[PDB]
Design a protein around this nucleic acid. Structure first.
Ligand SMILES: [Mg+2]
Ligand SMILES: [Mg+2]
Ligand SMILES: [Mg+2]
Ligand SMILES: [Mg+2]
Ligand SMILES: [Mg+2]
Ligand SMILES: [Mg+2]
Ligand SMILES: [Mg+2]
Ligand SMILES: [Mg+2]
Ligand SMILES: [Mg+2]
Ligand SMILES: [Mg+2]
Ligand SMILES: [Mg+2]
Ligand SMILES: [Mg+2]
Ligand SMILES: [Mg+2]
Ligand SMILES: [Mg+2]
Ligand SMILES: [Mg+2]
Ligand SMILES: [Mg+2]
Ligand SMILES: [Mg+2]
Ligand SMILES: [Mg+2]
Ligand SMILES: [Mg+2]
Ligand SMILES: [Mg+2]
Ligand SMILES: [Mg+2]
Ligand SMILES: [Mg+2]
Ligand SMILES: [Mg+2]
Ligand SMILES: [Mg+2]
Ligand SMILES: [Mg+2]
Ligand SMILES: [Mg+2]
Ligand SMILES: [Mg+2]
Ligand SMILES: [Mg+2]
Ligand SMILES: [Mg+2]
Ligand SMILES: [Mg+2]
Ligand SMILES: [Mg+2]
Ligand SMILES: [Mg+2]
Ligand SMILES: [Mg+2]
Ligand SMILES: [Mg+2]
Ligand SMILES: [Mg+2]
Ligand SMILES: [Mg+2]
Ligand SMILES: [Mg+2]
Ligand SMILES: [Mg+2]
Ligand SMILES: [Mg+2]
Ligand SMILES: [Mg+2]
Ligand SMILES: [Mg+2]
Ligand SMILES: [Mg+2]
Ligand SMILES: [Mg+2]
Ligand SMILES: [Mg+2]
Ligand SMILES: [Mg+2]
Ligand SMILES: [Mg+2]
Ligand SMILES: [Mg+2]
Ligand SMILES: [Mg+2]
Ligand SMILES: [Mg+2]
Ligand SMILES: [Mg+2]
Ligand SMILES: [Mg+2]
Ligand SMILES: [Mg+2]
Ligand SMILES: [Mg+2]
Ligand SMILES: [Mg+2]
Ligand SMILES: [Mg+2]
Ligand SMILES: [Mg+2]
Ligand SMILES: [Mg+2]
Ligand SMILES: [Mg+2]
Ligand SMILES: [Mg+2]
Ligand SMILES: [Mg+2]
Ligand SMILES: [Mg+2]
Ligand SMILES: [Mg+2]
Ligand SMILES: [Mg+2]
Ligand SMILES: [Mg+2]
Ligand SMILES: [Mg+2]
Ligand SMILES: [Mg+2]
Ligand SMILES: [Mg+2]
Ligand SMILES: [Mg+2]
Ligand SMILES: [Mg+2]
Ligand SMILES: [Mg+2]
Ligand SMILES: [Mg+2]
Ligand SMILES: [Mg+2]
Ligand SMILES: [Mg+2]
Ligand SMILES: [Mg+2]
Ligand SMILES: [Mg+2]
Ligand SMILES: [Mg+2]
Ligand SMILES: [Mg+2]
Ligand SMILES: [Mg+2]
Ligand SMILES: [Mg+2]
Ligand SMILES: [Mg+2]
Ligand SMILES: [Mg+2]
Ligand SMILES: [Mg+2]
Ligand SMILES: [Mg+2]
Ligand SMILES: [Mg+2]
Ligand SMILES: [Mg+2]
Ligand SMILES: [Mg+2]
Ligand SMILES: [Mg+2]
Ligand SMILES: [Mg+2]
Ligand SMILES: [Mg+2]
Ligand SMILES: [Mg+2]
Ligand SMILES: [Mg+2]
Ligand SMILES: [Mg+2]
Ligand SMILES: [Mg+2]
Ligand SMILES: [Mg+2]
Ligand SMILES: [Mg+2]
Ligand SMILES: [Mg+2]
Ligand SMILES: [Mg+2]
Ligand SMILES: [Mg+2]
Ligand SMILES: [Mg+2]
Ligand SMILES: [Mg+2]
Ligand SMILES: [Mg+2]
Ligand SMILES: [Mg+2]
Ligand SMILES: [Mg+2]
Ligand SMILES: [Mg+2]
Ligand SMILES: [Mg+2]
Ligand SMILES: [Mg+2]
Ligand SMILES: [Mg+2]
Ligand SMILES: [Mg+2]
Ligand SMILES: [Mg+2]
Ligand SMILES: [Mg+2]
Ligand SMILES: [Mg+2]
Ligand SMILES: [Mg+2]
Ligand SMILES: [Mg+2]
Ligand SMILES: [Mg+2]
Ligand SMILES: [Mg+2]
Ligand SMILES: [Mg+2]
Ligand SMILES: [Mg+2]
Ligand SMILES: [Mg+2]
Ligand SMILES: [Mg+2]
Ligand SMILES: [Mg+2]
Ligand SMILES: [Mg+2]
Ligand SMILES: [Mg+2]
Ligand SMILES: [Mg+2]
Ligand SMILES: [Mg+2]
Ligand SMILES: [Mg+2]
Ligand SMILES: [Mg+2]
Ligand SMILES: [Mg+2]
Ligand SMILES: [Mg+2]
Ligand SMILES: [Mg+2]
Ligand SMILES: [Mg+2]
Ligand SMILES: [Mg+2]
Ligand SMILES: [Mg+2]
Ligand SMILES: [Mg+2]
Ligand SMILES: [Mg+2]
Ligand SMILES: [Mg+2]
Ligand SMILES: [Mg+2]
Ligand SMILES: [Mg+2]
Ligand SMILES: [Mg+2]
Ligand SMILES: [Mg+2]
Ligand SMILES: [Mg+2]
Ligand SMILES: [Mg+2]
Ligand SMILES: [Mg+2]
Ligand SMILES: [Mg+2]
Ligand SMILES: [Mg+2]
Ligand SMILES: [Mg+2]
Ligand SMILES: [Mg+2]
Ligand SMILES: [Mg+2]
Ligand SMILES: [Mg+2]
Ligand SMILES: [Mg+2]
Ligand SMILES: [Mg+2]
Ligand SMILES: [Mg+2]
Ligand SMILES: [Mg+2]
Ligand SMILES: [Mg+2]
Ligand SMILES: [Mg+2]
Ligand SMILES: [Mg+2]
Ligand SMILES: [Mg+2]
Ligand SMILES: [Mg+2]
Ligand SMILES: [Mg+2]
Ligand SMILES: [Mg+2]
Ligand SMILES: [Mg+2]
Ligand SMILES: [Mg+2]
Ligand SMILES: [Mg+2]
Ligand SMILES: [Mg+2]
Lengths: 275, 48
RNA sequence: CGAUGUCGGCUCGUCGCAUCCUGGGGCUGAAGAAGGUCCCAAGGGUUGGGCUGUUCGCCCAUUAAAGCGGCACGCGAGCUG
RNA sequence: GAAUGCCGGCAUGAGUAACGAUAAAGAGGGUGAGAAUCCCUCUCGCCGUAAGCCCAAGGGUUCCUACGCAAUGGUCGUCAGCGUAGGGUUAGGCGGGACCUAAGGUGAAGCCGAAAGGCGUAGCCGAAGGGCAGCCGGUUAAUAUUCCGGCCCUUCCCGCAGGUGCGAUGGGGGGACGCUCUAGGCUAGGGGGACCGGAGCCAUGGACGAGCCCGGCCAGAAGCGCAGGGUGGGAGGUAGGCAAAUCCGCCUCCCAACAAGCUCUGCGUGGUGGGGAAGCCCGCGGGUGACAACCCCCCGAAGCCAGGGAGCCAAGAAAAGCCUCUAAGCACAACCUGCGGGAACCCGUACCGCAAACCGACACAGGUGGGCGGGUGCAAGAGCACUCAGGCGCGCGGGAGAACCCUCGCCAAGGAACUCUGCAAGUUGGCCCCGUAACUUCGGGAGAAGGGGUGCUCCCUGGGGUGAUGAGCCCCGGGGAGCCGCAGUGAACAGGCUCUGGCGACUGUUUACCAAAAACACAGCUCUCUGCGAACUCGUAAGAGGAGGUAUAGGGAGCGACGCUUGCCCGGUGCCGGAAGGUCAAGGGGAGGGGUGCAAGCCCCGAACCGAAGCCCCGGUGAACGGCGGCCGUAACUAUAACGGUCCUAAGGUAGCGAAAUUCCUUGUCGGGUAAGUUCCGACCUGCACGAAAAGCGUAACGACCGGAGCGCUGUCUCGGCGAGGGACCCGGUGAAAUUGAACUGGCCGUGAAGAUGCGGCCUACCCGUGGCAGGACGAAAAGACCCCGUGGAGCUUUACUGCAGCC
RNA sequence: GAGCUAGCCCUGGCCAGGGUGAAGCUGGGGUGAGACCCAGUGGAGGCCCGAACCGGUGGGGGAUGCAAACCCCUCGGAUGA
RNA sequence: UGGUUCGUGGAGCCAUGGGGGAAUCUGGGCGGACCACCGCCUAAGGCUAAGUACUCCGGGUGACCGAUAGCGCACCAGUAC
RNA sequence: GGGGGGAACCUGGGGAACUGAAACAUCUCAGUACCCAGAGGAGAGGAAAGAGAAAUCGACUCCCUGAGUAGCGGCGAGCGA
RNA sequence: CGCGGGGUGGAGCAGCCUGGUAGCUCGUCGGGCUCAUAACCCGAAGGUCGUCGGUUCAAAUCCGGCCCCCGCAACCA
RNA sequence: CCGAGGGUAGGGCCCGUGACUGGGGCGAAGUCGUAACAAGGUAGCUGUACCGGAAGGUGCGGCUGGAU
RNA sequence: UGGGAGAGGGUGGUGGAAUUCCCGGAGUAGCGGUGAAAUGCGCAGAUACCGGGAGGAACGCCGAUGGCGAAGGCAGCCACCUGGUCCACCCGUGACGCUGAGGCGCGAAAGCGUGGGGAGCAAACCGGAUUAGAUACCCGGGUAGUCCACGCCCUAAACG
């Protein structure tokens, strides 16, 4: 809940950081980190494949329980709430009572000291993890598996939320944060409550420099180029686009849908996203 | 001003050198050409 | 066209006379002073700025007058751009 | 005989330009056939965060010595980084390896690919990172943390004595980490000393003095003190750490804590071992001083204790070594402690190393990572002035003292009149104090602007550190009287200022090598795509990136902080939605027709109908591609038109701006500034041809961006003048190049392919140099880049043609 | 062929000295409790002056140069993209 | 689709990436779409020297060259650079 | 037993374009140049499921003829049994 | 200087391209409605189709030359 | 030392003035349409926002000073 | 002290009618709209009916000239937190009372800022009518906004 700055440089006129009220613990747990190999776009061929990434701050990757059905019925203590670079969310350290320690992501309203536990028998209180068919209709849920025992894919970003709008058969209907209505299988676990850090969208990055700290290089417009590089480029003067505005590589970028038409996942979606 | 040759005993022996060349059917042809040629020095003389 | 470097300005001149001033003369609707026009005459002189790349031009303050032209729209193996 | 022909040789230019830093040279002696140039000595100059020392790259005999000068040396050369020959590089501890892993590379499994090959989990390789035991002095012509002396230490093997469930390629701990600021105590390094050591000196007026000058340290096991770091202890249960666990983790009980104990490191003393100047006696080093002294005080780190503390978001490597835990296995073994004895391998080690030894063809004013980098006054400082050790005077000199060039200094009187512009060059310049406007995002503007002080002597007074409360030293002030000069940041390193307009908000980035900007980028806004094996991209594939991310996220596109805002048109293109319909390929279907045979039979065309994308068709869609009107009349002065009429369109430019970065006619008209203003600013609006995300109108602060104006000060100017040294000129030495049909190469007027030294006719004109100036020789250089030509060539575009990847 | 240049990945290093004084903490004030104000502390910033370092703004030299991009005076950044 | 001269042409033969998909001498393919006759030959497994090509090597011979010619090199060459 | 060389010669698996067509896309350069694999002193091919019209030849290779014939071609250039 | 559209009743447009025939609205004129005006209803007139020239049976029409009137291009130097 | 006044420099208030511009008041009869007075031909007034050539129109909310 | 009714405020949950949208059934030629017509919607199967799901805004009858508050204003039900006012008893204090320049707080609706939400309604806008003209009264689409959270704006026929 966001921290502003007095304008003592021009970049600090706008620049906001997150408060870090809710952090509890300032260096992460040593048994559970392993180094993020930075890429900068570069594949194994070493060409850039997506552009304009590079130059980040160095980072350590935190291993997360995205399953929670490892440890069914075995309850756990919320040890701490930590920073993680790699997510919009924050993270929760779980002290399980057999003393395996694990990270999970950090739902809103969760506080240190209280007790979470995963399974079909689990109570409906924030941060417990259940298969979807054992969760009531109408509730707000996160960290949602998509096919069962493949580990959690849906609603992992900050402040995000899925609503169970109901059941059909083996399958159960979610309102995703897009507002896609999509059948999920019931046996896919999910994890109750919505994700913390919900003022992540209200950061203003101030200046050029924070994007370089986050590893996002300058993005350079296609009408600033010359037409070998890009369709838009060149033209004496400035150019309006002159053509249906478009990628580098040819295809348009006002309105062309490119979801695959023959996808077998199409038989499980009710409603497209909106807005 | 900083001209183009900034020499390096490692980089020379790793790039132009022998166990570069026999790895690659580029370079296996190259020494094949030079041994066909007559040449005294197949790889560059690198100085260990 | 196996190159004839282009406008303007600066510096350096020189030439023609259909003459801006100055010299001489005729006519004048020339009283005098000052003017108009025409003839002879190139000895020498013909300022400093404001504006703009300026050639030209407009204006300011003077003058006796603030001339028209050529010389690869004189002049970059002298300069400037 | 020619081909800007090909190779070779020699001319011209020409004894010309230059001789590679305006840091600088003079003399005496020596050696020599020969000396401005080699050696020595004295005087003189230069760097002195370097132009001085130690590394790392790279170079690979250049290091040292003896014998030399043909050539390399921009001159000479007895000299050298040059020729010949010989010597020269020593390591258990420095660095690398027999230890580790990161990016990456290779890669048994396994996946993919016509071939070649491409991915790829484990593992290996990969270092200037982690781990790891050496400090001080001496010696040689050359090597030394390497040989020697002193004092310390590590691994392995063996042998003893004792102690313990020993045991790893496995589990756990630890190694283990950011940025900025910072505390305490040290040391490095430096300063002073009226105290200690000493060879010496009274010079020229004075000085025998608490006089001058020099020096007053290094290292050092055990132990000890100081300053730190690291660190909770027992019992029980326990499903987790992929077998086991006495270890770790989790839960419970108990114990004391700005502790303490255990352990580790830095610093000091520390048995002891070493060093030891100035000078002057010999000759690039050696003896004495001296038996050296080896004390105290002050400053003090970025370095150490170190993994210290505090704050902040962008959240800050892996493995091994080290400790512990157990399984197979052994439990005569195997480890742990202490000692003793033995064993200890390979590479480099010379030398330059901001340079004449490396990269620039060169002994080239260029480029090159890390460490030390002293002193003094400058507020501080790695800045600038002058210097210590140490190293150089840049490998052509001597002369004169022209024009003219580079670089520097000065000026009357005026102060931008020069001029595309104050281009350039001046004034101001540091610190402290007073004081500082509109405007605005409240931070700013702003060091705004504009002034006042700044040296030296004496006296009095305050605070802080070290101490001991003291002295002394160091730092930081306040007040009063007085002295000198033109001047007191007395030399050197230091902003000229304002007003106002255009553009971009800003800090940044860019055409290495002509453009640093208004261009790019930027946080910010919006549109669109994307439900995870995501969309997208690279690859035929495998597989990667995306991303070990999951719509507050990822791709694409366009504006581009912010304030106020972003209107109308779906007619055509685009994209999105639409099971009807029309058009539509292979295929299904087989009405009929044909060929052949005597025949069953074989074979060939083949209509109605069925039949997908795509298109046609029906809607939506502008922060999608785009577009946003003519003509005529009308108001009780004229003038204009708030009205009306009519035609087309899919719709006719709203706000806000406007002769503007856009305004052809045009220096539009009016006003301001100026004596005068094709510029600038404020307005008008008849916008050839602004205008709303190729965004519109503004906007404080910022800008080496671009116009305009003013103050201040000037050699920019009327308008030049003088002086300085580096060339230029003269002499001695060495000595090129572009170019060159050949030459004995004058002007005027003609003339000729038009602009003649050569043809014609006149005029002028003895032969040959040197310093200069540049009109010509249509001067040189480059087979015109503007233009055209060739059915030349190459990027780029598209509703050109045809095809291909891709997608449907 | 990435030993130049461009970008990224892994790993170390470098940035003298001075200036402004944000958050926060502590105290005082304030109200019923808050906001908020003041003082001290505190040292944040794509902050300011300004060397090494990275650049290359304007002007003069240089033009068969010292150099196939130099030198001089002048200037921008210099805890960050 | 490729090979044959065969560029779809009346397009057969030989090879075959896709789909359908039998029979054993009364059994199959061919004789240039196809039908008939009349003939040729026996696929879907492999082996086989001689004649043919070349000339880093050795010898023989040139109406081949004779140091800018002849191989790039007649010589310490694929070296110096 | 294989790996790896060998100036060419050979076979297979891939396979351009300048160019000719006086432009150029079918064509042509041409299955040439090159890349890769793989034989051996040779490689390839090889005993007819063939030729083609005489009821004829009798495995393959190589030279001469056939023959620039038959033919193939934006029936162009040219290709060529 | 060049190229290509237009001129028709008083105003704005339509009619041409394949010749004949001059249409629409507003205006104007006469009457009605109203107390009266405008609007509303009924009816009406008004045309060398810019010009000279032919062509052809015949020209607003088709083709040259001129007159206005509209706009456009005037580029590498 | 103080010091009348002069000079330089930056602020504050006030007056005149200024091309052009926004609006107002006034001015017997000009032009355009009719919102308010009746239920004013759509009840009106009002705060605010948007639009319009003009009164004014609509939205949202309130009042009756609105009749029937 | 005891008792009393009330849409008093705030927070969190919850029920139901209806509109609109989506899914399915069944069914045909017009629905809708007006003063009358048209735009539109509809054979691509509309309207009307039935069932199911999602979605938001407002709480019909009770309900009135009534209740509550200082004002603005407050209306389904449930709770929790909480304020003003009233009656009886006449227990306790002992004039502590009143208004109130400033100040500070609240303050309808439209508007503004960041993020949600958006079923209906609806300025601007587009169309169709009406009219000489109609930027409007009528009709069909239809964005902000109307709702929630926080922060601003602080006006009114805030009136009795
Ligand atoms: Mg780790
Ligand atoms: Mg890789
Ligand atoms: Mg690779
Ligand atoms: Mg986080
Ligand atoms: Mg460009
Ligand atoms: Mg490219
Ligand atoms: Mg490219
Ligand atoms: Mg393109
Ligand atoms: Mg374009
Ligand atoms: Mg360009
Ligand atoms: Mg343009
Ligand atoms: Mg050899
Ligand atoms: Mg050899
Ligand atoms: Mg020539
Ligand atoms: Mg005369
Ligand atoms: Mg005269
Ligand atoms: Mg006269
Ligand atoms: Mg007279
Ligand atoms: Mg001229
Ligand atoms: Mg001329
Ligand atoms: Mg000229
Ligand atoms: Mg010139
Ligand atoms: Mg010339
Ligand atoms: Mg000339
Ligand atoms: Mg120019
Ligand atoms: Mg030449
Ligand atoms: Mg000469
Ligand atoms: Mg000379
Ligand atoms: Mg000379
Ligand atoms: Mg010199
Ligand atoms: Mg002698
Ligand atoms: Mg010096
Ligand atoms: Mg060398
Ligand atoms: Mg040698
Ligand atoms: Mg030597
Ligand atoms: Mg010599
Ligand atoms: Mg000799
Ligand atoms: Mg010599
Ligand atoms: Mg000698
Ligand atoms: Mg030698
Ligand atoms: Mg060994
Ligand atoms: Mg590989
Ligand atoms: Mg390893
Ligand atoms: Mg190492
Ligand atoms: Mg190391
Ligand atoms: Mg070591
Ligand atoms: Mg004396
Ligand atoms: Mg001392
Ligand atoms: Mg010691
Ligand atoms: Mg276990
Ligand atoms: Mg000790
Ligand atoms: Mg000594
Ligand atoms: Mg720390
Ligand atoms: Mg390992
Ligand atoms: Mg043990
Ligand atoms: Mg021993
Ligand atoms: Mg050594
Ligand atoms: Mg050495
Ligand atoms: Mg250095
Ligand atoms: Mg050199
Ligand atoms: Mg030299
Ligand atoms: Mg050098
Ligand atoms: Mg550099
Ligand atoms: Mg450097
Ligand atoms: Mg110093
Ligand atoms: Mg001083
Ligand atoms: Mg210095
Ligand atoms: Mg020299
Ligand atoms: Mg002067
Ligand atoms: Mg003077
Ligand atoms: Mg002046
Ligand atoms: Mg002038
Ligand atoms: Mg200047
Ligand atoms: Mg000042
Ligand atoms: Mg003095
Ligand atoms: Mg001290
Ligand atoms: Mg200075
Ligand atoms: Mg301008
Ligand atoms: Mg900028
Ligand atoms: Mg450039
Ligand atoms: Mg270029
Ligand atoms: Mg710049
Ligand atoms: Mg530049
Ligand atoms: Mg914005
Ligand atoms: Mg993947
Ligand atoms: Mg990843
Ligand atoms: Mg832009
Ligand atoms: Mg503003
Ligand atoms: Mg459209
Ligand atoms: Mg459209
Ligand atoms: Mg359409
Ligand atoms: Mg039908
Ligand atoms: Mg068919
Ligand atoms: Mg179809
Ligand atoms: Mg728009
Ligand atoms: Mg409009
Ligand atoms: Mg204008
Ligand atoms: Mg314009
Ligand atoms: Mg736009
Ligand atoms: Mg813009
Ligand atoms: Mg503007
Ligand atoms: Mg501005
Ligand atoms: Mg700038
Ligand atoms: Mg900048
Ligand atoms: Mg000289
Ligand atoms: Mg002569
Ligand atoms: Mg002559
Ligand atoms: Mg002659
Ligand atoms: Mg001479
Ligand atoms: Mg000349
Ligand atoms: Mg000259
Ligand atoms: Mg020439
Ligand atoms: Mg030519
Ligand atoms: Mg060019
Ligand atoms: Mg042609
Ligand atoms: Mg052509
Ligand atoms: Mg062509
Ligand atoms: Mg690189
Ligand atoms: Mg590089
Ligand atoms: Mg700071
Ligand atoms: Mg800065
Ligand atoms: Mg700076
Ligand atoms: Mg600076
Ligand atoms: Mg340094
Ligand atoms: Mg640069
Ligand atoms: Mg420069
Ligand atoms: Mg110059
Ligand atoms: Mg600077
Ligand atoms: Mg074929
Ligand atoms: Mg097949
Ligand atoms: Mg067959
Ligand atoms: Mg057949
Ligand atoms: Mg046959
Ligand atoms: Mg000869
Ligand atoms: Mg030869
Ligand atoms: Mg082989
Ligand atoms: Mg082949
Ligand atoms: Mg051709
Ligand atoms: Mg062919
Ligand atoms: Mg064979
Ligand atoms: Mg047989
Ligand atoms: Mg052929
Ligand atoms: Mg062929
Ligand atoms: Mg041109
Ligand atoms: Mg051109
Ligand atoms: Mg052109
Ligand atoms: Mg006074
Ligand atoms: Mg006074
Ligand atoms: Mg009315
Ligand atoms: Mg009304
Ligand atoms: Mg309205
Ligand atoms: Mg009210
Ligand atoms: Mg009611
Ligand atoms: Mg009582
Ligand atoms: Mg409201
Ligand atoms: Mg608004
Ligand atoms: Mg509606
Ligand atoms: Mg309308
Ligand atoms: Mg109308
Ligand atoms: Mg709607
Ligand atoms: Mg709005
Ligand atoms: Mg809005
Ligand atoms: Mg309010």
């Amino acid at each position: 809940a966001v921290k502003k700055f007095k304008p003592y440089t021009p970049s600090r006129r706008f620049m906001t950081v997150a408060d870090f009220s809710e952090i509890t613990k300032t260096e992460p747990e040593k048994s559970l980190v392993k180094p993020l190999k930075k890429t900068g776009g570069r594949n194994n061929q070493g060409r850039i494949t997506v552009r304009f990434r590079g130059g980040g701050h160095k980072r350590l990757y935190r291993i997360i329980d995205f399953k929670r059905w490892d440890k069914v019925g075995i309850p756990a203590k919320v040890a701490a709430i930590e920073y993680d670079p790699n997510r919009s969310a924050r993270i929760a350290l779980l002290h399980y009572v057999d003393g395996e320690k694990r990270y999970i992501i950090a739902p809103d309203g969760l506080q240190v000291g209280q007790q979470v536990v995963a399974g079909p028998d689990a109570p409906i209180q924030v941060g417990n993890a259940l298969p979807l068919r054992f969760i009531p209709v109408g509730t707000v849920v996160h960290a949602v598996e998509l096919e069962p025992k493949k580990g959690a894919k849906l609603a992992r970003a900050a402040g995000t939320s899925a609503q169970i709008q109901g059941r059909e058969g083996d399958y159960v209907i979610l309102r995703l944060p897009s507002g896609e209505l999509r059948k999920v299988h019931g046996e896919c676990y999910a994890t109750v409550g919505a994700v913390g850090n919900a003022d992540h969208k209200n950061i203003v990055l101030g200046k050029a420099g924070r994007s370089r700290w986050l590893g996002r290089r300058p993005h350079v417009r296609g009408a600033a180029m010359n037409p070998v590089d890009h369709p838009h480029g060149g033209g004496e003067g400035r150019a309006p686009r002159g053509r249906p505005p478009a990628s580098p590589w040819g295809w348009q970028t006002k309105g062309l849908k490119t979801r695959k038409r023959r996808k077998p996942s199409s038989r499980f979606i009710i409603a497209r996203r909106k807005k | 001003m900083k001209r183009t040759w900034q020499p390096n005993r490692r980089k020379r022996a790793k790039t132009h050198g022998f166990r570069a060349r026999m790895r690659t059917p580029g370079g296996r042809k190259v020494l094949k050409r030079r041994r066909q040629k007559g040449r005294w020095r197949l790889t560059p003389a690198v100085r260990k």
